[PDB]
Design an enzyme around this catalytic site. Structure first.
Site, short mmCIF file in Angstrom:
data_model
loop_
_atom_site.label_atom_id
_atom_site.label_comp_id
_atom_site.label_asym_id
_atom_site.label_seq_id
_atom_site.Cartn_x
_atom_site.Cartn_y
_atom_site.Cartn_z
N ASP A 189 -24.51 -27.52 -16.04
CA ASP A 189 -25.37 -26.41 -15.67
C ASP A 189 -24.50 -25.17 -15.42
O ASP A 189 -23.99 -24.95 -14.32
CB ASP A 189 -26.16 -26.78 -14.42
CG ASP A 189 -26.92 -25.60 -13.84
OD1 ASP A 189 -27.31 -24.70 -14.61
OD2 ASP A 189 -27.13 -25.59 -12.60
N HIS A 345 -17.14 -23.96 -9.73
CA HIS A 345 -17.09 -23.79 -11.18
C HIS A 345 -16.04 -22.71 -11.43
O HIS A 345 -15.76 -21.91 -10.54
CB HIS A 345 -18.43 -23.27 -11.69
CG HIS A 345 -19.29 -24.32 -12.32
ND1 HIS A 345 -19.01 -24.88 -13.55
CD2 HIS A 345 -20.44 -24.91 -11.90
CE1 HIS A 345 -19.95 -25.75 -13.86
NE2 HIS A 345 -20.83 -25.79 -12.87
N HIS A 379 -17.60 -29.30 -13.51
CA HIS A 379 -17.68 -30.76 -13.66
C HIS A 379 -16.74 -31.02 -14.83
O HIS A 379 -17.15 -31.45 -15.91
CB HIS A 379 -19.11 -31.20 -14.05
CG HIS A 379 -20.15 -30.90 -13.01
ND1 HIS A 379 -20.22 -31.57 -11.81
CD2 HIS A 379 -21.18 -30.02 -13.01
CE1 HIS A 379 -21.24 -31.11 -11.11
NE2 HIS A 379 -21.84 -30.16 -11.81
N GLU A 404 -20.87 -34.61 -19.23
CA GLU A 404 -22.21 -34.45 -18.68
C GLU A 404 -23.20 -34.42 -19.83
O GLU A 404 -23.10 -33.57 -20.71
CB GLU A 404 -22.37 -33.17 -17.85
CG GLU A 404 -23.82 -33.05 -17.38
CD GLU A 404 -24.05 -32.06 -16.26
OE1 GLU A 404 -23.08 -31.64 -15.59
OE2 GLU A 404 -25.23 -31.71 -16.03
N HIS A 406 -26.70 -34.54 -19.21
CA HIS A 406 -27.93 -34.36 -18.44
C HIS A 406 -29.22 -34.23 -19.26
O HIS A 406 -30.26 -34.78 -18.88
CB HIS A 406 -27.76 -33.12 -17.55
CG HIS A 406 -28.65 -33.11 -16.34
ND1 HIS A 406 -28.46 -32.24 -15.29
CD2 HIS A 406 -29.71 -33.88 -16.00
CE1 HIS A 406 -29.37 -32.46 -14.36
NE2 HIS A 406 -30.14 -33.46 -14.77
N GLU A 449 -23.97 -36.18 -13.93
CA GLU A 449 -25.30 -36.29 -14.50
C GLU A 449 -25.36 -36.77 -15.95
O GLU A 449 -25.72 -36.03 -16.87
CB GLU A 449 -26.01 -34.93 -14.34
CG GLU A 449 -25.97 -34.46 -12.89
CD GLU A 449 -26.67 -33.13 -12.66
OE1 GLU A 449 -26.32 -32.12 -13.31
OE2 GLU A 449 -27.57 -33.10 -11.80
N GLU A 525 -22.82 -33.38 -3.93
CA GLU A 525 -23.54 -32.11 -3.92
C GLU A 525 -24.62 -32.11 -2.83
O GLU A 525 -25.37 -33.09 -2.70
CB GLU A 525 -24.22 -31.85 -5.27
CG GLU A 525 -23.26 -31.55 -6.41
CD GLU A 525 -23.96 -31.50 -7.76
OE1 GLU A 525 -25.08 -30.95 -7.84
OE2 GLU A 525 -23.37 -32.00 -8.75
N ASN A 585 -33.92 -20.08 -21.48
CA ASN A 585 -32.92 -19.96 -20.43
C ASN A 585 -33.49 -20.44 -19.11
O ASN A 585 -34.70 -20.65 -19.00
CB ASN A 585 -32.49 -18.49 -20.29
CG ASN A 585 -33.62 -17.61 -19.77
OD1 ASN A 585 -33.95 -17.64 -18.58
ND2 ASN A 585 -34.22 -16.83 -20.66
N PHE A 589 -31.23 -19.66 -11.87
CA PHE A 589 -30.68 -20.93 -11.40
C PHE A 589 -29.17 -21.04 -11.56
O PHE A 589 -28.57 -22.05 -11.17
CB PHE A 589 -31.35 -22.11 -12.11
CG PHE A 589 -32.48 -22.72 -11.33
CD1 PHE A 589 -33.72 -22.08 -11.26
CD2 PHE A 589 -32.31 -23.92 -10.65
CE1 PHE A 589 -34.76 -22.62 -10.51
CE2 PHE A 589 -33.34 -24.48 -9.90
CZ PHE A 589 -34.57 -23.82 -9.83
N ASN A 592 -26.05 -20.04 -7.26
CA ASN A 592 -26.25 -20.93 -6.12
C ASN A 592 -25.03 -20.92 -5.21
O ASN A 592 -24.85 -21.84 -4.41
CB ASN A 592 -26.43 -22.39 -6.57
CG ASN A 592 -27.11 -22.52 -7.91
OD1 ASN A 592 -28.22 -22.02 -8.12
ND2 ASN A 592 -26.46 -23.20 -8.83
#
Ligand SMILES: CC(C)S[C@@H]1O[C@H](CO)[C@H](O)[C@H](O)[C@H]1O
Ligand SMILES: [Mg+2]
Ligand SMILES: [Mg+2]
Ligand SMILES: [Mg+2]
Ligand code: NA
Ligand code: NA
Ligand code: NA
Ligand code: NA
Ligand code: NA
Lengths: 1011, 204
Positions: A189, A345, A379, A404, A406, A449, A525, A585, A589, A592
């Site tokens: 993400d 990140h 990640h 990942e 996901h 994930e 997390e 998109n 989000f 964070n």
């Protein structure tokens, strides 16, 4: 061969992975870690050209520069240069899910560089090129000849250029594909970018060389003794005169050394490794490494001849520490850790995903300054420099494989497929081969994930087998599978269970004691910090401190992933998902973090720092008990400051040196405190100050604090009654009250105070009316959107109930003249489609002193969703420069996020009362306020409030903060009550029950007058 | 109780009595009570109470009003939690509904006398000709808190003239995790510092 559409081919002619090399030809240089003449950087200006697909790349590009190409800086992401758009999507893959295929329109970046090579580099030895990071796949050519191919965007790909180079000028050609089969394993993400985003360099190694080396440290029971073991591998011709010497240094002092010829011990029926040797060094009373005290030694590995001629030298920093799980607890050097971590990140608002030393340092300093002691590489493996900094500054690190998936359905579709085991294993094994010597790395992670597949069990066991010195964790498939040594759930709540099918998220307290469970629990997390968040953060830390096996977690996350764009006036502004035409998109989000993209702190950062304090306090009488949560260090750079104040007015203060042993206690006796003359509440505030600067903090740094209410003297004395008496003028449309130069106007049709005057100056732009809603926070919205509504999200429930559309219906508006005042009584009913949501009953009492006492009693239908707030609001005509208040501050604080705030007298410029969240919403609230001052106004009582140039309506209708426009006057929101903000996660309701406004009936009172 | 204020005002359709008291002990002000009694044409008396509790005094056992009524009726009718005695931290079993019991059932005969018989979440109470409305807790019996407090055995209790009524806006939990150390959980302690409650007294 379309190697980018075959998970069976992840590289071609790539060299084996290994720990950081520099090939020093001088031992002292290796010892001191000074630049090596054998390691050159190729960073700088390169030639670049963009193509829609690999089929559009001209063959001539292999032989010579394309005149149409541009000169650009490398490392870099080409989206940051404007060649194409960066894409922000969370779960859903940015390409059609059709493994192992990718779109035919595959953005291709053609990089090239004309560089010089010293002849001495070609007259002997091996010259290799190292690409620390290429997103996401690429082919390499040198002087027109094809060299190789490589995948995995987050680990270095190395190739031997020895047979392709000539003395003097050479030209590299690198064709980078945006999408590849590797993309199916990189669905993290974050913004989806591409290019040569990490360093590129040339390394020269002798033909006979050190090809790998592993450093391990074993200890006795009390860590008073240790054995450093170094396994060294070589390549090239074996000779009996060859020797390997490993020396360990403590500063400028060599503390241990060992030499031996190659030839390891017998391992099986065929013998042993003739090309390896293991040195063992004894170390008495080693200085142990920890995030508290990052003690480091220097290990130098010398490959030489018996006569003493050095061939080459390699080295690394060594941290003597033991990581192990025992009796259900994660221990470091025998002590149970309490992880004050955060997910980070690699993001830069200007450079995208290119990392630099200064930014890394800034992050580490801010993290440590805010009491974090751990970081999770969410990640994927990070830029190599990151680990060196964590080793030296002292941070526990969770190194994670770049895996990942996901967006697969189900999540483990690839990870349980043996066909993908090869690609996955390389992302895990090459990470371990690169970073295993870094002391800061204490835990290995299999990825993120990607559900739970058999490939995870295989790779979990591989790690346990090759490196038993570090635990292995993985959250996929339920957070407590057979592929993890640690229960590592993401967003599991403290007390509330979330029994999702197959992969439930139990209350963390409950998780620990499930039948048969014995592992420690550390959240990979938690506390999703999207916008105005971190509500309930303190609940987590209370549990972490009470339960031994709840050893902390990693907040999500460190920094907002916003990117910078420019408008007409060339002014830059923070952009998020969809702002680049990227579609589909996942909008905001991508933001964070605890800090903005430019590293400016969000208010939530202070809450985390407070809850993550290393010193705990208790008060009994005149005694303060200070308890240390450090495991290894004494408080040798701490001073305790204490202050006693009566409603902000200081009465006494002092300082006491802190001398507490790790996990120890200290009792501090406060001297006799004078007796307060005036009535009011006495408050005790203590704070720990670090007198001396450190590598991560300046002198005077405040590391912890705590407050307590002491004696309170209730005011009983009555003020001298005023001779003046207000006068009531009644008309059909209004009730006016005059008191000398002051006038109050109540509209008899609306039932509200519509205007106030001080002389001939109007004081309001908008009437004083009740307010039961707020511009929705990220947590109020969740995943809901116009095209996909989530009926369960708080904002949707309020909307559907008509809270935002409700109209005030006047039920009563009367005026009475008392002996010394005028009394206005009103009653309103807020309804929506025949449904009465709220009923507000008020009384306004204006006396000769010019003070207006407002009493409010509200009824909330038990069957309407609990309101975001219960207060009043109006637009003041005044625009002052300062805001002065007696209450919790100085930073923004909410009911479920106010433990860090302190009660005192605060004074700030109006602009600091507004928090610039990229996505606008209710913000700037300050709770537990007894007095508020702004211009000629003063409000007294016990309320929460925010004040700014932006109405809730504008904040609610504006998508980006740069589009906000200061309105006329100043908007004031005074709440008797306000709902929590939540944050346990940001896709489902997360405001705990004790912070929801469900009492049905509420009462609050305010006194409005002049300061 | 120390009187700080007591005034009377005549309104359009009502009389408004404003009072304020301070409860002290050796110079220390423990509580402050500010009230308003509004008596309108319909013969109803609306009582508004706002109390201040010093943050440094141990949280009070209750916050309400009490008085000895001349009336002695056979029944007690109320719309609230019942029918049995229930306290803030022991009221999950009680049900909200219209309850009607003989006065004697509003008293629990604990061998060792103490506060007893309370009923929470009551919106309406009816006794004899009196009716009280609002949102309060209450107990009503022939024994004053003072007698219960001075008597060691229930058989030594004697009915006093009239009926004692205790109407609380708030009442502290009773606890019980054990009976040898404070056991009332923090969420059931009256620590808000400032409390508000309203009662309407009238003739049923
Ligand atoms: C969108 C949720 C259902 S999945 C949720 O989204 C978050 C967005 O910040 C993070 O990426 C979390 O790790 C992820 O699990
Ligand atoms: Mg491939
Ligand atoms: Mg994800
Ligand atoms: Mg506190
Ligand atoms: Na713990
Ligand atoms: Na995110
Ligand atoms: Na000290
Ligand atoms: Na908005
Ligand atoms: Na007794």
């Amino acid at each position: 061969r379309r190697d980018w559409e075959n998970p069976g081919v992840t590289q071609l002619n790539r060299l084996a992975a290994h720990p950081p090399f520099a090939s020093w030809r001088n031992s002292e240089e290796a010892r001191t870690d000074r630049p090596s003449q054998q390691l050159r950087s190729l960073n700088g200006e390169w030639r670049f050209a963009w193509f829609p697909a690999p089929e559009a790349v001209p063959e001539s590009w292999l032989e010579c520069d394309l005149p149409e190409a541009d000169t650009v800086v490398v490392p870099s992401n080409w989206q940051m240069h404007g060649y194409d758009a960066p894409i922000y999507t969370n779960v859903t893959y940015p390409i059609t899910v059709n493994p192992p295929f990718v779109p035919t329109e595959n953005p291709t970046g053609c990089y090239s560089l004309t560089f010089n090579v010293d002849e001495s580099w070609l007259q002997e030895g091996q010259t290799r090129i190292i690409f620390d990071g290429v997103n996401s796949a690429f082919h390499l050519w040198c002087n027109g000849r094809w060299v190789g191919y490589g995948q995995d965007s987050r680990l270095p790909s190395e190739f031997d250029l020895s047979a392709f180079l000539r003395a003097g000028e050479n030209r590299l050609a690198v064709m980078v594909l945006r999408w590849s089969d590797g993309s199916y394993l990189e669905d993290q993400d974050m913004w989806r970018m591409s290019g040569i985003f990490r360093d590129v360099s040339l390394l020269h190694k002798p033909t006979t060389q050190i090809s790998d080396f592993h450093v391990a440290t074993r200890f006795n029971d009390d860590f008073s003794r240790a054995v450093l073991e170094a396994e060294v591998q070589m390549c090239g011709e074996l000779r009996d005169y060859l020797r390997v010497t490993v020396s360990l240094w403590q500063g400028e002092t060599q503390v241990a050394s060992g030499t031996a010829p190659f030839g390891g011990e017998i391992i099986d029926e065929r013998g042993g490794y003739a090309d390896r040797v293991t040195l063992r060094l004894n170390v008495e009373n080693p200085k142990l490494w920890s995030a508290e005290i990052p003690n480091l030694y220097r290990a130098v590995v010398e490959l030489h001849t018996a006569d003493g001629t050095l061939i080459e030298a390699e080295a690394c920093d060594v941290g003597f520490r033991e990581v192990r799980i025992e009796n259900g607890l994660l221990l470091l050097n025998g002590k149970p850790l309490l992880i004050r971590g955060v997910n980070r990140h690699e993001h830069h608002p200007l450079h995208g995903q290119v990392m630099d030393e200064q930014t890394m340092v800034q992050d580490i300093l801010l993290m440590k300054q805010n009491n974090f002691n751990a970081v999770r590489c969410s990640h994927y493996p990070n830029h190599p420099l990151w680990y060196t900094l964590c080793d030296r500054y002292g941070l526990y690190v969770v190194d994670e494989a770049n895996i990942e998936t996901h967006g697969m359905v189900p999540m483990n579709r690839l990870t349980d497929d043996p066909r993908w085991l090869p690609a996955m294993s390389e992302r895990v094994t090459r990470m371990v081969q690169r970073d295993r010597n870094h002391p800061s790395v204490i835990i290995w992670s299999l990825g993120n994930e990607s559900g739970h597949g058999a490939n995870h069990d295989a790779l979990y066991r591989w790690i346990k087998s090759v490196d038993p010195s570090r635990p292995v964790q993985y959250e996929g498939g339920g957070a407590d599978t057979t592929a993890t040594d640690i229960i590592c759930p993401m967003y599991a709540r403290v007390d509330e269970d979330q029994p999702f099918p197959a992969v439930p998220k139990w209350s963390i307290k409950k998780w620990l004691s499930l039948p048969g469970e014995t592992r420690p629990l550390i959240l990979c997390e938690y506390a999703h910090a999207a916008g105005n968040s971190l509500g309930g953060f303190a609940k987590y830390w209370q549990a972490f401190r009470q339960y031994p096996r709840l050893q902390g977690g990693f907040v999500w996350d460190w920094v907002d992933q916003s990117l910078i764009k420019y408008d007409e006036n060339g002014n830059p502004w923070s952009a998020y998902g969809g702002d680049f035409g990227d579609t589909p998109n996942d909008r905001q989000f991508c933001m964070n973090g605890l800090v903005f993209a430019d590293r400016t702190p969000h208010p939530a950062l202070t809450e985390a720092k407070h809850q993550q304090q290393f010193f705990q306090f208790r008060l009994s009488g005149q005694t303060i008990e200070v308890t240390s949560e450090y495991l290894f260090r004494h408080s040798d750079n701490e001073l305790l400051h204490w202050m006693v104040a009566l409603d902000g007015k200081p009465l006494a203060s002092g300082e006491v040196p802190l001398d507490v042993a790790p996990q120890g206690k200290q009792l501090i006796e406060l001297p006799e405190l004078p007796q307060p003359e005036s009535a009011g509440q006495l408050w005790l505030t203590v704070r720990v100050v670090q007198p001396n600067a450190t590598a991560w903090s300046e002198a005077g740094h405040i590391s912890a604090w705590q407050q307590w209410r002491l004696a309170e003297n209730l005011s009983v004395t009555l003020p001298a009654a005023s001779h003046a008496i207000p006068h009531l003028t009644t008309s059909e449309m209004d009730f006016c009250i005059e008191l000398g130069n002051k006038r109050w106007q109540f509209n008899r049709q609306s039932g509200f105070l519509s205007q106030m005057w001080i002389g001939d100056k109007k004081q309001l732009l908008t009437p004083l009316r009740d307010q039961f809603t707020r511009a929705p926070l990220d947590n109020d919205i969740g995943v809901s959107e116009a095209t996909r509504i989530d009926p369960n999200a708080w904002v949707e429930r309020w909307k559907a109930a008509g809270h935002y559309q409700a109209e005030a219906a006047l039920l009563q508006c009367t005026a009475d003249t008392l002996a010394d005042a005028v009394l206005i009584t009103t009653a309103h009913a807020w309804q929506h489609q025949g449904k009465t949501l709220f009923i507000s009953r008020k009384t306004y009492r204006i006396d000769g002193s010019g003070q207006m006492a407002i009493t409010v009693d509200v009824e909330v239908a038990s069957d309407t969703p609990h309101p975001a707030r219960i207060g009043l609001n109006c637009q003041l005509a005044q625009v002052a420069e300062r805001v002065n208040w007696l209450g919790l501050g100085p930073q923004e604080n909410y009911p479920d996020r106010l433990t860090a705030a302190c009660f005192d007298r605060w004074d700030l410029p109006l602009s600091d009362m507004y928090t610039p969240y990229v996505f606008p919403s209710e913000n700037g609230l300050r709770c537990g306020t007894r007095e508020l001052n702004y211009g000629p106004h003063q409000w007294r009582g016990d309320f929460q409030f925010n004040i700014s140039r932006y109405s809730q309506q504008q904040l609610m209708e504006t998508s980006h903060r740069h589009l906000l426009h200061a309105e006329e006057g100043t908007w004031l929101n005074i709440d008797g009550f306000h709902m929590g903000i939540g944050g346990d996660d940001s896709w489902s309701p997360s405001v705990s029950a004790e912070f929801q406004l469900s009492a049905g009936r509420y009462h609050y009172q305010l006194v409005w007058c002049q300061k």
